[PDB]
Amino acid sequence: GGGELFATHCAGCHPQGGNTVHPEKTLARARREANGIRTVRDVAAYIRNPGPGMPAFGEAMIPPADALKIGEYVVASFP
Numbered sequence: 001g002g003g004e005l006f007a008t009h010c011a012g013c014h015p016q017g018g019n020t021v022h023p024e025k026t027l028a029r030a031r032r033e034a035n036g037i038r039t040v041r042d043v044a045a046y047i048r049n050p051g052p053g054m055p056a057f058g059e060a061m062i063p064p065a066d067a068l069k070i071g072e073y074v075v076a077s078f079p
């Protein structure tokens with residue numbers, strides 16, 4: 001499940017869709033979209049080449065199908 005993948009790999013730094021490292025860059029829809037992360041595929045692609053301070057999630061670690069599940073959970077969970 002997308003929710004479980006998020007809890008495992010992302011919730012530590014993005015609890016409830018926030019950001020413990022860079023306060024301004026939360027997962028809230030308006031914030032992420034202002035930075036070009038709008039679609040499920042945008043989220044999936046972003047984790048492979050993220051911004052400073054965020055570890056990169058390669059395809060070997062998180063296969064395409066799972067990256068999409070994470071994206072599906074992110075867009076629906078954080079308005």
Ligand code: HEM
Pocket residue numbers: 006009010011012013014019021022025026027031032035037043046047050051052053054055057070074
């Ligand atoms: C696969 C799980 C994760 C997802 C889905 C995710 C997703 C995102 C997204 C969409 C953004 C906003 C990008 C922007 O607006 O420019 C972001 C930013 C960020 N994430 Fe994550 N993240 C994940 C895991 C992590 C982890 C584990 C950490 C903490 C070690 C982390 C730290 C950050 C930081 C520091 C930023 C700011 C990057 C910058 O300053 O450009 N993220 N993340």
